[PDB]
Amino acid sequence: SDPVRQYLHEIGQVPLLTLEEEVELARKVEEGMEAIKKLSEITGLDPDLIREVVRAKILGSARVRHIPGLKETLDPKTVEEIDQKLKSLPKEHKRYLHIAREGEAARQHLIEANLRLVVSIAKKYTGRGLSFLDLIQEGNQGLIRAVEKFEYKRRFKFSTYATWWIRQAINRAIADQARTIRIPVHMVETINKLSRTARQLQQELGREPTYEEIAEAMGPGWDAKRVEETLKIAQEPVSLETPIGDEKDSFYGDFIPDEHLPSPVDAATQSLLSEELEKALSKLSEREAMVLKLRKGLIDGREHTLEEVGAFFGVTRERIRQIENKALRKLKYHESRTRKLRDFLD
Amino acid sequence: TLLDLSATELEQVLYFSKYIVLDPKGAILNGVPVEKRQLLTDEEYRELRYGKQETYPLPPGVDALVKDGEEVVKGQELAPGVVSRLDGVALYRFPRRVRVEYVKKERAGLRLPLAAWVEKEAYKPGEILAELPEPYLFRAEEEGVVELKELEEGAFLVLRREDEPVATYFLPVGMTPLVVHGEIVEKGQPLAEAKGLLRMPRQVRAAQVEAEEEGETVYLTLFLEWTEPKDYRVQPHMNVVVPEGARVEAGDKIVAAIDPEEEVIAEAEGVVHLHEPASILVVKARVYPFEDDVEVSTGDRVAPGDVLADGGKVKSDVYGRVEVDLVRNVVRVVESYDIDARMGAEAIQQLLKELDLEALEKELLEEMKHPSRARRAKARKRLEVVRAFLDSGNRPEWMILEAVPVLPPDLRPMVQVDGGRFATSDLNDLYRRLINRNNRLKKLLAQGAPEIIIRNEKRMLQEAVDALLDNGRRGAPVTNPGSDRPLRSLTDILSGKQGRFRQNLLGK
DNA sequence: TATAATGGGAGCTGTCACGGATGCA
DNA sequence: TGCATCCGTGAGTGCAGC
């Protein structure tokens, strides 16, 4: 029913490691990685492919999918070929395979055992724009990074090194996903810094600070305009479904006109404009009207150069420019005469 | 209705509360065999798929009542405070101390009254060496300094004049040594007193016996073989690289560590005994020791009558998963079925694809003639859906979404209002939730994430799709941060008084 | 990138009647 | 098989409404 409760149950299934269990798991993982590198040395194959194969057989055929980094599409066929190629190796070499498998299994068990930590850390990041479950999952990604990067040699407990990567992943997630209009992480940092600065400033000023005071507190490079624009780009959008009035019958989006699609008046005006221009078309001769339509882009929509209309009508560019000039001139005279195209100039 | 699954059940499978089984591979839960479309809990699926096992704590200072690799029956106490709830192969977890019994084969002399000595070519442990009517003083036949080496029972004297030993005497049980360590002894002074019956210690056996008769006495040169124990302490950061009862030689390492100086290396030939484990692991499994190269690696799943190790000699007894132990040099098969039981809309889509419509129509038709009214009713209700799909030409599995459509952007605008500020439809936020969760799912898959994580992610993905299509239909309605207002989904857009039909269609 | 850190947190209460399912006696 | 019982779905129109 409640997804969080359900997940907390599934987490409550796997029991917490002891110091020895943790050390052994970490050790098996590390030695497993070493073994994969050794198998890469022996076989002369790609360590990543080998790792994906060992992980494939450990996880089973229940999960097999093409890895973005891998060169070959990963399917039961290829993993069977590679597995059999790994079965083809001498006892001391074939040993490293067992080391690798044990490594993967240890990795899985390590993560699964440490899933509680992620929750305990993520519970404090709520209200920051991501759901609890999302924070948990991103924190889990962090946990995975921590597992693959851990060194048991340092004798530090796993939680210490894990917490860093977990917080890292949660915060990266918050910075990356939380805005409908996405903002770069460094810019999010700058914005949050501006917020904290303004909040401290207001905490000592007994009022909200001006742009100038914030600019002062931000240091050199920061003036009022920079603070103002930074606050401008930080603005988040509002819902179109935002309710208006005490009833349920009015949306905020109902008050917003469409500026894109031309109005009936605008459309009709463009229509009468085209029709009237064609009047003056039949007016000027065929050639000068066509030259004007080519140069102004009424024909294909592009505006031709003098050399193009000149090569088209078979005259010099000077000539075509001259007939364009006289065309425009006759149009000017006729326009002064009939005052027809004046009203379309607003 | 189509798959004959009650609302609660479909809820359980889609939302990952329970597994549903496909191609069971003959699993057995509580004595009853498993057949397709059965509802398995998490514990049940884990017991069936990954096998049954448990681990028990050992309080500080207490040792094991059982041995590593030893089969165990339910109820059998592994310790004074520990009893195993199941049957299977017990295994040691993190032994605190390693005892090494060192093999020593040496030569030692003794002199006894001829009347007392019972003549034998060899002496087994505990076997009486001699029977003495009166107290007898064994005397030194050499001069030098005394090295007294005391076993559990029985002793050794080594006389060294130059620091080079000139004598070795054996003192079996019943002889109380009259000398201390490092004592200076001249020739013919008593090193011991023999009283009553004297016999071989339990620790040492006499392999060979030579005897020289001189005067009224016999001098026995005994070729003896015995083991001397040495304890080693293992710290939590150390691991044992040697199996229970392993023959080791000088230079070999019993226990590794972080740094070489804290390592445990074997000084001499001896057998290894693992004592005081941190915990004991009881697994239901079949053990298969191997003398040579093994054909199957760790994690592989195998049926009875399968190749394991030694070029096809040792094979598989039960169904299970293969754990190859290099430390103990044994292939261990934890007993588990290969059963395929999935969760979520993938399972459901599979079952949907596997429905033959005509067949089910026939079934329900034969069901419609039943005397019971309820059965005819339910069969009618089902046959209505079945025949709906049949007549329409729609594939049932299309009720599952592989590819979620995306509305044209102009219908879910992002628009700059008068003041230059932006206003936008909720559908964008819903779609963003969806895409974030999907992408995170693909990355978690590609990176080989554990099953709990992937399960959580899939559940969240389904709920995301739900929120997109009909929000608040199942579970809490998705809201924007800092607001209690439910987001407006496609269903909301369509229906109601404010819906598309009534607002924009039947009136304008 | 390493002291250790290991199961959440807010609930929302004064309808009202019907159709339809589901369950339990 | 009949009867609790729980869940889900409805509950006038147009104005304006910040």
UniProtKB/Swiss-Prot annotation, chain B:
Signal peptide: none annotated. DNA-dependent RNA polymerase catalyzes the transcription of DNA into RNA using the four ribonucleoside triphosphates as substrates. Belongs to the RNA polymerase beta' chain family. The RNAP catalytic core consists of 2 alpha, 1 beta, 1 beta' and 1 omega subunit. When a sigma factor is associated with the core the holoenzyme is formed, which can initiate transcription. This is DNA-directed RNA polymerase subunit beta'. It comes from Thermus thermophilus (strain ATCC 27634 / DSM 579 / HB8). The lineage of its organism: Bacteria, Thermotogati, Deinococcota, Deinococci, Thermales. The chain holds residues 114 to 621 of 1524 of the full protein.
